[PDB]
Amino acid sequence: GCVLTAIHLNVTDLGLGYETKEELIFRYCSGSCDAAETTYDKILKNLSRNRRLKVGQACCRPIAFDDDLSFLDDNLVYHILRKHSAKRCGCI
Amino acid sequence: GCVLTAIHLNVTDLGLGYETKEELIFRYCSGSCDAAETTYDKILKNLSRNRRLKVGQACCRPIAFDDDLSFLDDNLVYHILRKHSAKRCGCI
Amino acid sequence: KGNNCLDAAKACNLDDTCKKYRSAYITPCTTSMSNEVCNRRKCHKALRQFFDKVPAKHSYGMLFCSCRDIACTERRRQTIVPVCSYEERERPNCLSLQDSCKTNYICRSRLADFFTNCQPESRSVSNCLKENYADCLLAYSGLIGTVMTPNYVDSSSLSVAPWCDCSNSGNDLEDCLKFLNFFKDNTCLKNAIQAFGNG
Amino acid sequence: KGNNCLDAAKACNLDDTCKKYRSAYITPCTTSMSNEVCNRRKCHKALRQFFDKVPAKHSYGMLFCSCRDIACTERRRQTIVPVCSYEERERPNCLSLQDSCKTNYICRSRLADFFTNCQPESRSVSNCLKENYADCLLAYSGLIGTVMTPNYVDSSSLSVAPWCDCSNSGNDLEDCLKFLNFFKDNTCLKNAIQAFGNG
Numbered sequence A, B: 001g002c003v004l005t006a007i008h009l010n011v012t013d014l015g016l017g018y019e020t021k022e023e024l025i026f027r028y029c030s031g032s033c034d035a036a037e038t039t040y041d042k043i044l045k046n047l048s049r050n051r052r053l054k055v056g057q058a059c060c061r062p063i064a065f066d067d068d069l070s071f072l073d074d075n076l077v078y079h080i081l082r083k084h085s086a087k088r089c090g091c092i
Numbered sequence C, D: 001k002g003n004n005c006l007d008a009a010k011a012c013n014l015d016d017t018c019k020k021y022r023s024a025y026i027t028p029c030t031t032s033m034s035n036e037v038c039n040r041r042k043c044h045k046a047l048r049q050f051f052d053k054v055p056a057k058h059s060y061g062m063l064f065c066s067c068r069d070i071a072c073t074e075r076r077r078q079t080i081v082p083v084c085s086y087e088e089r090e091r092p093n094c095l096s097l098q099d100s101c102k103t104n105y106i107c108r109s110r111l112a113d114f115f116t117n118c119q120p121e122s123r124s125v126s127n128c129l130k131e132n133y134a135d136c137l138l139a140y141s142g143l144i145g146t147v148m149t150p151n152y153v154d155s156s157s158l159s160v161a162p163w164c165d166c167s168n169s170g171n172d173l174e175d176c177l178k179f180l181n182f183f184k185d186n187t188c189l190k191n192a193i194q195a196f197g198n199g
């Protein structure tokens, strides 16, 4: 249920302060988590039920990031985006 | 706001299948996250607002785990708990 | 109400030092997930590390605790993981094993220490002095993880022994028994273990 | 409506290969966060890698795109990050620089190639053959990242030059000009760049 998903966007769609016409493929992690598989989450879930414990469980998040993305803004200056986009996803 | 917290529990309180009288200190991560600091979350939050994107942001989670915990059950068998407890926490 | 040996296990798990090294020996010594065979040398190695790195306060509670019932004695006996650290197919002759221990520096050093510190005060007075109790306990605990690893042998006493018998002694029978009874029937060692769990 | 040079940048960012190596040269070549000084050698190294690892389809779009206005030409001119890869305090004499290029295998190999492939078809016919267009473009692009890194020098033509002038030529003035005009006024090179952006 925790999957990678890709969308084709303008760099301005990211809202990071840039005034450009350059573009990218942005990738992200979506979905819900298994609720188990670590000992830690088994304990969080169990402690919650017997109420001897809202903050706890895992999240579908990036485990790898894409390559740096470069672009020339409208004012003839280059910029580099680092770890802007995800390569793989896991529940962590 | 993302902090470590420690509680003194029975091993049976963990509900991992064991029938013992042995004990532990269980540690966990609690709180909400800053909502920024990575480029990735800045983009998730921005894409959500302009609605060109509920699954997204970071979580206060364990970044380090405690030492293995051992115990003898009531049936005279030993068991070892691995990565059951957290040492440090970050938003990831 | 519980146990003193269980009381000890809680104190050890709630102490960062003791907990770490306890798990570091249980790991290589414990089977029982399958029956399998442990790595005796890693187990012994982990065991020596346990008693050398963890203070006596926590490391003795585990081993020298007093017991009220047979269940308590069984816990106390599993301390060293005897299925791995202790028992073997057969028991060799004790004098044979004594010789084998004297060829290993570590064991030779430890056996000497036991025999030095866990002996009678004088020539008639069975028990050793009380201020010598600690150094005798240090020597017995120190044998654990050597080829001369000892353990408690029953439910109704603090008698201990290594994994050897006196079959095939010949003319050397009395000396073999004299060696084995230095573990089994040690007045100073019993009394030191009785004083630790005061009462 | 936009740009052909901007059209090229989108194609490069949407291609895993081109995108990777574009960023790999921008990194060591770009300043403008402070004014500072780039590592010319890392920049040159990254630039050579860009044109050798990325297919002509994507790597030429960036460099040989056609332009309709002065803004487009400025984008095209910033392709190689000239503040870093190109300009210096002063311009040396061109023949001096030619000599310096011939002492570096990489540059010597590339300059030879340029002079081989970017020359007239015959003894009167100004332009080279059309099926030789690709190999001339390969040779000019190949000079980028050497000490003979060239770039476009104005807004109203496809004239290019390295960072050298013909001051202090003496009796060698005409040959220096002959060398510099082989970049500035190359009929085959202009026509190859005109044919790439068909029209």
Ligand SMILES: *[C@@H]1O[C@H](CO)[C@@H](O)[C@H](O)[C@H]1NC(C)=O
Pocket: A008, A009, A010
């Ligand atoms: C990106 O930018 C242009 C701006 O002119 C916009 O009109 C267009 O819809 C966008 N294209 C995308 C996201 O593919």
Ligand SMILES: *[C@@H]1O[C@H](CO)[C@@H](O)[C@H](O)[C@H]1NC(C)=O
Pocket: B008, B009, B010
């Ligand atoms: C743990 O176990 C005992 C079981 O007898 C229980 O009564 C006690 O409340 C628990 N103690 C803790 C969590 O400190």
